[PDB]
Design a protein around this nucleic acid. Structure first.
Ligand SMILES: Nc1nc2c(ncn2[C@@H]2O[C@H](COP(=O)(O)OP(=O)(O)O)[C@@H](O)[C@H]2O)c(=O)[nH]1
Ligand SMILES: [Mg+2]
Ligand SMILES: [Mg+2]
Ligand SMILES: [Mg+2]
Ligand SMILES: [Mg+2]
Ligand SMILES: [Mg+2]
Ligand SMILES: [Mg+2]
Ligand SMILES: [Mg+2]
Ligand SMILES: [Mg+2]
Ligand SMILES: [Mg+2]
Ligand SMILES: [Mg+2]
Ligand SMILES: [Mg+2]
Ligand SMILES: [Mg+2]
Ligand SMILES: [Mg+2]
Ligand SMILES: [Mg+2]
Ligand SMILES: [Mg+2]
Ligand SMILES: [Mg+2]
Ligand SMILES: [Mg+2]
Ligand SMILES: [Mg+2]
Ligand SMILES: [Mg+2]
Ligand SMILES: [Mg+2]
Ligand SMILES: [Mg+2]
Ligand SMILES: [Mg+2]
Ligand SMILES: [Mg+2]
Ligand SMILES: [Mg+2]
Ligand SMILES: [Mg+2]
Ligand SMILES: [Mg+2]
Ligand SMILES: [Mg+2]
Lengths: 703, 82, 85, 62, 205
RNA sequence: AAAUUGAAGAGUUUGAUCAUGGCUCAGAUUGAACGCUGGCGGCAGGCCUAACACAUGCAAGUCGAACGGUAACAGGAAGAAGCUUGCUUCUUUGCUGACGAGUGGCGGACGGGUGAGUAAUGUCUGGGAAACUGCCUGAUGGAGGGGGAUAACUACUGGAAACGGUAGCUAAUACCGCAUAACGUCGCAAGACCAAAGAGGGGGACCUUCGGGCCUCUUGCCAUCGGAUGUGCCCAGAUGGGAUUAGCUAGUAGGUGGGGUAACGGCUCACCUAGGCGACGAUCCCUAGCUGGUCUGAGAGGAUGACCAGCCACACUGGAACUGAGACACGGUCCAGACUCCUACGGGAGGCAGCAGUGGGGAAUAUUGCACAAUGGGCGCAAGCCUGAUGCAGCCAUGCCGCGUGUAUGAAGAAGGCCUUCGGGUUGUAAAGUACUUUCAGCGGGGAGGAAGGGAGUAAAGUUAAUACCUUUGCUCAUUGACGUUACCCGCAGAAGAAGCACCGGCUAACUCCGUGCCAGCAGCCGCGGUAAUACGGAGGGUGCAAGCGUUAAUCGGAAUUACUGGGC
């Protein structure tokens, strides 16, 4: 039945900063397990994981791709383990993707560069992994590059991220003469062979060049491993050397509770270290049943609603972590079965939305390539064709299973752009493309603001957002150029008050009626009410008929609602009716509303009121070294500031900035802060601003 | 094999077959050489469920016509001896 | 291909080789008879006709050609040889 | 072809896509088609309450 | 598929009595039967040939509780059947199961007969029928089911079933609560106010 | 008995009339779409345009009762694993059930799809001769005898794969010669010539080399004459528009001879004649699958070919053939073209107009579903396997039909709206209130029928030489439904969960007020709106239809408005 035992299943992710060697380390993994005949290089687009045309051309991973392998051992020590590795992206432009893959996986191998070590995206993946408490290990890649030092990278990890790291494999030699690595348990130096592409290696006697630091760190490894149970420490302090098996098990325990991360070193480009990192994935990373079960809520929660041991007998439960786009079926749902068994054709219940979905074609994955499989067992990552409504993060299960799983959080887009196709009448096709790309990606949203015709595109970055437009050009072909959003202004009176009026000679004999109103315009103040329309009834002279006395406020709405000046609504206008004229036969309301309109018009021209811009509450965090640069950038713009606050891990700056300015502020912020700042918009009250554009939007049309 | 088979006419969830002597290549409801009686499967009442045309069926089977399984069963049940 | 109609393809090619061999042998024997009839030596034409006749009857029986085709060959050749005198 | 825009008030700009049906307006010589209101971004006649199946106006609650 | 509204409006629009109410009180005492239902009912619009044909057809439609599609079907069937079209049409309208139920009591109105037929309380010739359009046939025995006998409406309807002309084609046995359908009513066996040729020529236009 | 019983008009040229004459409406119908609304069930329908391009999964396999054989499972056999001479399982033996791959047989030419081409090589109707036909069936016979291979396999080997090489083999219902065959072929005659294959079940002997021989029955093979079916071919009539298409044709029309076809034939070749078709429309151009039938019409007729069924044609475009009874072959071969895909760059694979499904086009047309349980089809002695045929399920008020959204009672004729002559009227028994019912929807419980068959045992005869083994007909046994939480029945709660769409000047059924003021707007036709609009917009009221309604598109009718029936100058 089940091909591989549940213990011999690894669902692992490869997460780190941009270009740390993650996509290569995956190629060398697929090479040392024989599934790909050619090694392939990321720069020459040969990489199988980089299947999208953008990924080939720009040498970046714009998506998560899944693959499988069978790593027996370095000497075939263990039975073949089925490792499901989903390569992930490091660009801040695509963070949903890394968190998306990160949630389901049981372990993470965090790549690092020897030159740089801890980098901004490395802290980002660290915080994402820490919130989901995934057990982690680390690989220091690019040890061949100059400036390489294992020790410094270890110290950077300890000092910055916060973990206390235990070295597992040190490095023999400098950057160019990187022969191989020495393990701190078997006490063997696995020097790799240059002639062949890393497939073979030769074990040596760990020469005296590094025989004292090696012993020291080996001892530190022993001591760190002994902090798993009192039985380890008691024998350790007894003067006897612990056996390798208990050391490895105690380390596996410490990784399981996430106290420590095990750091291995190697260089994928130099075809070295990859076999040892995969070996340490088998030895130390957790299998699905090597942790306690996942929890959930049933019928608005319970004491212990679900503790589903991953097994082939319990009822089916899963999570759809990823949605992809297939032009030929219309969807591609990636799911991890946490506990249960499902098969082709089987129906499931989407617990959150309470509906029925049929699994048409469950398949397994090798990057873009798809291989049909009849059934999926528990703990396996697969893709489900035939799903047409399930959003990212929705639990898919058979009936009487946990309704809601913990995967209920997604980030907020920072960059907002507009887009408009060259031929304007491709709007329906573009809208369909945007709707699909927004349903698949929850961090990309498309809302068409109804003041204008523009389609608003929100994303995590300018890269993100332009990959979402050239991808449209290539697949589901449409040609569209991006631009800037338009302006949503409002108006406030510049402290002017009078008793203006309006009058038209509607009588003429035959017509039979006329209307006149005496109003009193005033503002209240900038931002005391949500309901800008204020009206306190006070009609004294010429009191109108008593069936529609309070009904002379809704008729004023059709002027305040939209468009008195340059097609922009108005806020804070107060009307106060004192006098007028009528005749109590049939005083026509619709032609009495003309007097009020001309009264508003006259009040507007005599008032000389000025335009009000949208200004929001941005809040930014940053390290206490770039405070000057960020505040200088806001000061260069017409931006106010609010809060002298310093956090413990940074500083929270609060600033009031316009909306027509600061277009693409996030990317500039990342540039001037080394990509280590975020922000948010709270849409606070509008503020006055001297603007040469405020009158140019109405003098474009003249009078 | 010129066959004598049921032709499956009628309505949804209530079949009513036509015993037709038709060449075995043509479809079930397709071209036939002759129709020899009907057969109502769902009849469980006084009116006759089935009716055959015994002399023409005998002529055909003497001319080498193949008899289907259900048509053989209806020839059986129609005869009093079986 | 896709299905197991490739077996019929191999059987068809082998049968084409065999049928082409045997049909060519038949046709060369009949060309021999025609050359004899066009030479005018009635005795060689009669011997050639009596040599081709069992060949064509055997193949007509096997099904490589039809009984009508064999009978047409024998009838035409007998008519030719009889008017040859 | 030329085509009428029925109802009271429209929103037809220079590139808006619309559905065209048969008809005639008779007083306009050369207009033999009518714009189907309330279909394909040609919004329905505002504040309409009678003959509402035509002009593409959704049902008020009332 | 059923008019759930004010029946008396219908009656006074046709002017005559459509028998859409029980005999508890007279028709005039419940509605102003003389005038039309509108606020302009007091006035009188001069009739037209199409007007009177439509009004006769609608009077028949409102009496029997039939909709236009079914009534058109009953006219295609009546035209198909040999003999006088209007006579066949009246037979097909009296053949309706709610019609025969009403004419046999058990409901003070044809809408009550529709409720009785629909709520699985009727057995025609043994088989429990609950289809209000069931075309009754000669020698059919209409029986009420158990758990429906002695209910308030059936008792009120049986007592109220008197004071009206007994149909000469039904031969109902009141006490045991079974009735027969010995033969279809002929032309002269009905209201005689219904001008059937008007409807026939309206539907043959 | 009955197979019909069937034919309506109106508005609009005019100051008004009568004719002529056109436009429009009332009806029926749709593979429909759009707008508004939407409860259920049954039966049907569902890419009308791009025969545009297709990812993916299935749409054709089967037979061990043809054969060599053993890859996988099981049963055993010999044991010196495990061991208490084993219940706690080591390998080998096709030995037996079985069976991957292979040789071979049959199917793959059926079923399914589409209408591009085709105006006549097609179809329909009615005949005909110059024909073939696997499987089905009847009649007569034969069914001696032998050989060479060869796949599979073994070895070496090449290739990324696809797929091969090169030697050694090993069978067969694979192939080949001989013998033999005449109411069979050729020949006027005489005469000459042509075939095969065996396998399975059991068994009284009796002989063996436990291979079996031998006796039975069941199938299978070969020849010939028949029938049935299916197919090929020919003739006549009919089957669109254009003369703003009058000449067309050189194998062209025919004859003789040779060749070819299963078969007649310029089908083809070599000569010879100079014919042949055409004003009854040849030739050319555009369009088009044809028919039973569908819609309409009282008919005659007009339009049409969605469903269903028959025939034809096509399978990415063009051409040619092979195997085979049958093809010039959807899911076969070869080539040329274009497209797409895999590649290790050396090469290789494919053709959804099969069922789903995608892109695109379009106003517009469904699920990447469940079973072979029914009936069929292929294979097989069967059991059984396969079948995207078929039976079902899903989506969509797309159509037709049926039902429900309550029923009775109820005058303060409530409030409120609207009109008002200010009296009142209308909304209106309508509501509320009172009494009663629970169809259908929702829960809970019972529950047909579509199921015939097939398998094992048994008995009876038929069978032989044998009560065995095989047919056939009964008796018993366990049984086979995807649909399916089936139809249907019973119970539980309560009127709860269920009404909208168009119109209201005349045609045409149903009128007033308000706001607008030749404006905004309505309209199928006549027309309306420039200060009292039943014609616009809203409100009240009413009329028609109703889970639908209206609009648009299309056909016929009305249209006697192409008038043959049935018109005029
Ligand atoms: N020198 C060197 N270059 C490396 C190494 N690993 C990867 N690279 C290259 O560095 C670049 C970034 O590595 P890549 O795997 O694309 O990173 P990712 O995009 O974050 O997965 C590519 O051009 C790689 O070929 C390494 O160990 N040494
Ligand atoms: Mg990468
Ligand atoms: Mg209905
Ligand atoms: Mg195509
Ligand atoms: Mg086999
Ligand atoms: Mg041999
Ligand atoms: Mg043979
Ligand atoms: Mg000849
Ligand atoms: Mg012509
Ligand atoms: Mg065509
Ligand atoms: Mg007519
Ligand atoms: Mg079709
Ligand atoms: Mg051929
Ligand atoms: Mg195909
Ligand atoms: Mg084929
Ligand atoms: Mg489209
Ligand atoms: Mg079957
Ligand atoms: Mg199937
Ligand atoms: Mg009132
Ligand atoms: Mg129910
Ligand atoms: Mg049954
Ligand atoms: Mg039975
Ligand atoms: Mg009227
Ligand atoms: Mg109309
Ligand atoms: Mg007015
Ligand atoms: Mg109006
Ligand atoms: Mg006519
Ligand atoms: Mg005339």
């Amino acid at each position: 039945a089940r091909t591989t035992p549940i213990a011999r299943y690894r669902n692992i992710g490869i997460s780190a900063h941009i270009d740390a060697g993650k996509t290569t380390t995956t190629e060398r993994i697929l090479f040392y397990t024989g599934v790909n005949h050619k090694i392939g290089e990321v720069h020459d687009g040969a990489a199988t994981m980089d299947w999208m045309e953008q990924e080939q051309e720009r040498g970046i991973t714009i998506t998560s791709a899944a693959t499988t392998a069978f790593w027996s051992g370095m000497a075939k020590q263990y039975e073949p383990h089925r490792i499901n590795i989903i390569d992930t992206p490091g660009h801040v432009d695509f963070t949903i993707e890394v968190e998306r893959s990160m949630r389901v996986l049981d372990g993470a191998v965090m790549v690092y560069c020897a030159v740089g070590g801890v980098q901004p995206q490395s802290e980002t993946v660290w915080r994402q992994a820490n919130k989901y408490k995934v057990p982690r290990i680390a690989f220091v890649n690019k040890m061949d590059r100059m400036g390489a030092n294992f020790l410094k990278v270890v110290n950077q990890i300890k000092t910055r991220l916060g973990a206390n790291p235990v070295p597992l494999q040190l490095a023999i030699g400098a950057e160019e003469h990187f022969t191989g690595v020495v393990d701190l348990v078997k006490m063997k130096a696995i020097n790799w062979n240059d002639a062949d592409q890393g497939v073979t290696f030769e074990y040596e006697d760990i020469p005296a060049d590094m025989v004292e630091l090696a012993n020291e760190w080996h001892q530190n490894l022993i001591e760190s491993a002994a902090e798993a149970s009192e039985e380890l420490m008691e024998k350790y302090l007894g003067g006897e050397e612990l056996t390798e098996a208990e050391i490895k098990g105690a380390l596996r325990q410490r990784v399981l509770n996430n106290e420590i991360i095990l750091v291995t070193c190697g260089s994928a480009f130099k075809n070295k270290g990859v076999q040892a990192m995969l070996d340490a994935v088998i030895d130390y990373l957790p299998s699905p049943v090597d942790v306690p079960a996942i929890n959930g809520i049933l019928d608005d929660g319970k004491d212990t609603p679900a503790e589903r041991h991953a097994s082939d007998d319990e009822p089916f439960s899963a999570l759809a972590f990823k949605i992809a786009t297939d032009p030929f079926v219309g969807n591609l749902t990636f799911f991890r079965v946490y506990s249960g068994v499902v098969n082709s054709g089987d129906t499931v219940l989407n617990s959150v939305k309470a509906a029925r979905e049929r699994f048409g074609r469950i398949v397994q994955m090798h990057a873009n390539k798809r291989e049909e499989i009849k059934e999926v067992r528990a703990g396996d990552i697969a893709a489900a064709i035939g799903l047409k409504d399930v959003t990212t993060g929705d639990t898919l299960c058979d009936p009487d299973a946990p309704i809601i799983l913990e995967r209920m959080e997604f980030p907020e887009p920072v960059i907002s752009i507009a887009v408009e196709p060259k031929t304007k009448a491709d709007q329906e096709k573009m809208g369909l493309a945007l709707g699909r790309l927004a349903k698949e990606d929850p961090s990309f949203r498309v809302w068409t603001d109804e003041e204008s015709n523009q389609t608003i595109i929100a994303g995590m970055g300018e890269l993100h957002l332009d990959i979402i437009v050239d991808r449209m050009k290539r697949e589901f072909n449409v040609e569209a150029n991006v631009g800037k959003p338009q302006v949503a202004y409002r108006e406030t009176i510049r402290q002017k008050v009078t008793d203006v009026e309006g009058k038209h000679a509607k009588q003429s004999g035959g017509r039979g009626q006329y209307g006149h109103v005496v109003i009193d315009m005033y503002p209240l103040e900038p931002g005391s009410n949500p309901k800008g329309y204020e009206f306190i009834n006070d009609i004294k002279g010429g009191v109108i008929p008593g069936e529609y006395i309070p009904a002379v406020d809704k008729g004023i709405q059709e002027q305040l609602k939209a468009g008195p000046l340059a097609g922009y609504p108005v806020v804070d206008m107060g009307i106060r009716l004192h006098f007028g004229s009528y005749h109590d036969v049939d005083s026509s309301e619709l032609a009495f509303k003309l007097a009020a309109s001309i009264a508003f018009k006259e009040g507007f021209k005599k008032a000389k009121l000025v335009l009000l811009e949208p200004i929001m509450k941005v809040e930014v965090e940053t390290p206490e070294e770039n405070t000057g640069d960020v505040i200088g950038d806001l000061s260069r713009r017409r931006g106010m500031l609010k809060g002298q606050e310093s956090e413990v891990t940074g500083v929270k700056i609060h600033a009031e900035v316009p909306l027509s300015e600061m277009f693409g502020y996030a990317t500039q912020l990342r540039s001037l802060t080394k990509g280590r700042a975020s922000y948010t918009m709270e849409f606070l009250k509008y503020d006055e601003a001297p603007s040469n554009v405020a009158q140019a939007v109405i003098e474009a049309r003249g009078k | 094999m010129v066959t004598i088979r049921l032709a499956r006419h009628g309505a949804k969830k209530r079949p009513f077959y036509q015993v037709v002597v038709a060449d075995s290549r043509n479809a079930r409801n397709g071209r036939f050489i002759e129709r020899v009686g009907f057969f109502n499967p769902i009849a469980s009442e006084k009116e006759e469920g089935t009716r055959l045309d015994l002399d023409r069926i005998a002529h055909w089977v003497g001319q080498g016509a193949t008899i289907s399984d259900r048509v053989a069963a209806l020839i059986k049940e129609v005869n009093k001896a079986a | 291909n896709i299905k197991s109609a490739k077996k019929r393809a191999i059987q068809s090619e082998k049968a084409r080789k065999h049928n082409a061999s045997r049909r060519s042998m038949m046709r060369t024997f009949i060309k021999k008879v025609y050359a004899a009839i066009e030479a005018g030596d009635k005795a060689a034409a009669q011997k050639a006709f009596n040599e081709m006749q069992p060949i064509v009857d055997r193949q007509a029986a096997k099904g490589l050609i039809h009984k009508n085709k064999a009978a047409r060959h024998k009838a035409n050749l007998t008519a030719q040889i009889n008017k040859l005198a | 072809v030329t085509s009428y825009i029925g109802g009271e008030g429209h929103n037809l700009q220079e590139h808006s896509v619309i559905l065209i049906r048969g008809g005639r307006v008779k007083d306009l010589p050369g207009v033999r088609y009518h714009t189907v209101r309330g279909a394909l971004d040609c919004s329905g006649v505002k504040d309409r309450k009678q003959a509402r199946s035509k002009y593409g106006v959704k049902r008020p609650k009332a | 598929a059923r008019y759930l509204g004010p029946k008396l409006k219908l009656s006074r629009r046709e002017g005559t009595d459509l028998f859409l109410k029980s005999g508890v009180r007279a028709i005039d005492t419940k509605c102003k039967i003389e005038q039309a239902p509108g606020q302009h009912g007091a006035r009188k619009p001069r009739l037209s040939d199409y007007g009177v044909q439509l009004r006769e057809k609608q009077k028949v439609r409102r009496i029997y509780g039939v909709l236009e599609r079914q009534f058109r079907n009953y006219y295609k069937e009546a035209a198909r059947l040999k003999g006088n079209t209007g006579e066949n049409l009246l037979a097909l309208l009296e053949g309706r199961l709610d019609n025969v139920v009403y004419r046999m009591g058990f409901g003070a109105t044809r809408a009550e007969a529709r409720q009785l037929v629909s709520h699985k309380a009727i057995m025609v010739n043994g088989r429990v029928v609950n289809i209000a359009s069931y075309q009754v046939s000669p020698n059919d025995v209409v029986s009420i089911r158990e758990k429906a006998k002695k209910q308030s409406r059936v008792k009120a309807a049986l007592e109220l079933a008197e004071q009206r002309e007994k149909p000469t084609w039904l031969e109902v046995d009141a006490g045991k609560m079974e009735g027969t359908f010995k033969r279809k009513p002929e032309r002269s066996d009905l209201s005689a106010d219904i001008n059937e040729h008007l409807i026939v020529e309206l539907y043959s236009k």
